[PDB]
Amino acid sequence: GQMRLPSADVYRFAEPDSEENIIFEEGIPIIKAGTVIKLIERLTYHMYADPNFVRTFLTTYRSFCKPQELLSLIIERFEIPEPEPTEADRIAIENGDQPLSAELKRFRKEYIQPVQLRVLNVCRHWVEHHFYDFERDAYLLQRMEEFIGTVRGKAMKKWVESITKIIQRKKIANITFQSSPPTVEWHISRPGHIETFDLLTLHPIEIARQLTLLESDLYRAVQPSELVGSVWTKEDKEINSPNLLKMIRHTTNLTLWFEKCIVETENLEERVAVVSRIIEILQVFQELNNFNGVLEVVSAMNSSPVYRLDHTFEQIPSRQKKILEEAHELSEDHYKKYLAKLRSINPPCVPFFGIYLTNILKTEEGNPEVLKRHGKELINFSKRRKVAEITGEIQQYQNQPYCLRVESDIKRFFENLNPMGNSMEKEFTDYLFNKSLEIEPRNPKPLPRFPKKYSYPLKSPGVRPSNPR
Amino acid sequence: GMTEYKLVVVGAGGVGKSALTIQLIQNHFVDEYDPTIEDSYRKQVVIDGETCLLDILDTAGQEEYSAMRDQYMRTGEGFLCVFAINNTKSFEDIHQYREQIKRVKDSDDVPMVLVGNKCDLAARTVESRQAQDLARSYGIPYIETSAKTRQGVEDAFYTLVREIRQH
Amino acid sequence: MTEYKLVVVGAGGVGKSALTIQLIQNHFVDEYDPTIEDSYRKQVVIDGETCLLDILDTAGQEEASAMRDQYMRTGEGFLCVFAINNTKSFEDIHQYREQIKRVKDSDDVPMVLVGNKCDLAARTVESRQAQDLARSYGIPYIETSAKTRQGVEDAFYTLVREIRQH
């Protein structure tokens, strides 16, 4: 038979399941909705572990339970009463013999020890992967340190001593590869001559590599805390989502730099060379699976100032027209081909973040926080699972590092890029559009001629890498 | 077969813009949504007795990718320009959204509707007369919608389709 | 994308977590933080086919030994890890092998025998003894180092191939 449980009057987590406190989806069960008590029971269930659920719960719980209250509830879960001696134990003791304590021993082995270890696993995941709760509430951290540091008894001792050390390390807080990274490539600009760095003077291969390292680092720095609750759209977004916003602002700046390089090149022949070079950078982005970089280029080519430059795009080689067209097709039909390509490639990659943001926001906005059943309000956990499926996908692509060498001067050049200068956005984008009208006027105005601005060769070195001994 | 209309929702972030399309496309009568599902943004409808397919692009949440707006806007035949009735700044943004649409589409007469969205119970700061006057100055319809009761949602999209049909 | 459920089992301290984190993050963990249960995901192209690996990293400490049936039921394939400088961990392998066979009620479960810490000179389990055991199970034997990456991809991706051909 099943183990008997403590009275629900002394231990709240022994109340029987009912549709008034938990609802399952239609081989471990998947929870659609429940009370916070039932969610925590299943988070730390004696019959099975549910590591996905631990991640889902710790990522999303603040929408229905405060951090201080979560800690109180898992401490309450941990403190399980032991059953009294049975009739057979009583009779043995009355005869001066040692009781077998069979029911007590089974309850310890199959209920107390698994539940307690799974509570500690929640604590361990909380500290290791969601430490921001403790960075933002020093008293919460004190309570966690006190709880862990006062767990007695030898069955939990190894993990209690370990979690104590992990907490202390997190308070005061290296890559190996299958091969060597390829050699850094140089074109007109030579190493150390940062004053000459520009779109056409750096090697297009190395532009794409260094932007990919930068954009990968920005992608990898975004934590779920910047996403749950749609906080990057709210009034405190600069406080709550700074790494996400830094990543987006880099993408915007690079797109605008591409547009500025194009329309400020007034000579037609030179401007064709500029556009052709940007499409070569896009080709290397594709080879590197840097989809953020691919769409940075596509966004620039589709911008109002650039899209209308028919005289320029007429002279682009056919093979480059095809590269740009197949990159543009990734975004068509609501990113259908992009989504399929992302799910097919071999990482490392840099995803485009915008789709994730829209899906998290619409999942939050389109589903209710609670479900009303039998007069009770149950937490709608299915909504939180959907959000955590998205944050889990994001995290999966954050793991794999690029095997490319940093070039510190090229990295600094792109970190310091500032195409808008001190201008406001409307000012600047109106300037770009007026430049477009200057260099290729609306029909029937005649096409003017403009002097060259570059004194160095415009011929591209190409995007196939070289390898000296 | 039936005509497909490519509609684009534009407007300030953080003020409930996404509720318009969610409420339209939703199981009208079950409050639930999975935006990741293929064709959670396509809906077959009958407008004035003529069946058509709406394909709605709503990039809510991507407002900070400001250099992508041109690309997203060029996909559209008609536009819903959305502001929140309790956020004056989102109303003041409308002029620049309209100017950007006209530039991207290279036309002074692009099908569009102005939508004032009530996204919570916070106090209204844009009166309906202010929004009606703005819409009239542009020559476009004005529709007010609730983000909670679905009121006005069908009217906003159907009015835009009629603007496309009568262009 | 086909999804594969891999489970990493073996005695405490043999390097199950270090192997998994090396595969997932290309990083070697120096600390010895005993695992309760952790799970990882990895998209990777293997033999030209994209798949999604779900990797369950399990507890080796004996205090968790009564909690294994629940994860053995869900796993498709098992990495059975010992450390080549720890003869007791090698003797513990057969207990994991027999429990997996009981739980899954099968003599034919995808498995790979892994001898970890092969960067260390002071070996106490000879390759031949481990290879003999592997042959008796019908499974391959791969020596690995979570520290240097030697053999790490080979161990995990060989297990994927076993599940695929099962």
Ligand SMILES: Cc1ccc2[nH]cc(C[C@H](N)C(=O)NC3CCN(Cc4c[nH]c5ccc(Cl)cc45)CC3)c2c1
């Ligand atoms: C791919 C490509 C390139 C140059 C090209 N010249 C001519 C063509 C053939 C096409 N049928 C044609 O007449 N197209 C129009 C005139 C040329 N622009 C190019 C353009 C600017 N920004 C873009 C962002 C994305 C894409 Cl896909 C394209 C562009 C598009 C409109 C062509 C095709």
Ligand SMILES: Nc1nc2c(ncn2[C@@H]2O[C@H](COP(=O)(O)OP(=O)(O)NP(=O)(O)O)[C@@H](O)[C@H]2O)c(=O)[nH]1
């Ligand atoms: N030299 C060397 N040390 C290793 C290797 N793999 C793991 N270690 C070290 O061995 C210790 C235990 O590693 P760990 O991955 O925690 O082992 P585990 O099998 O996961 N332990 P548990 O079962 O308790 O979770 C750590 O100090 C780790 O750095 C290896 O390949 N070489």
Ligand SMILES: [Mg+2]
């Ligand atoms: Mg471990």
Ligand code: NA
């Ligand atoms: Na206001």
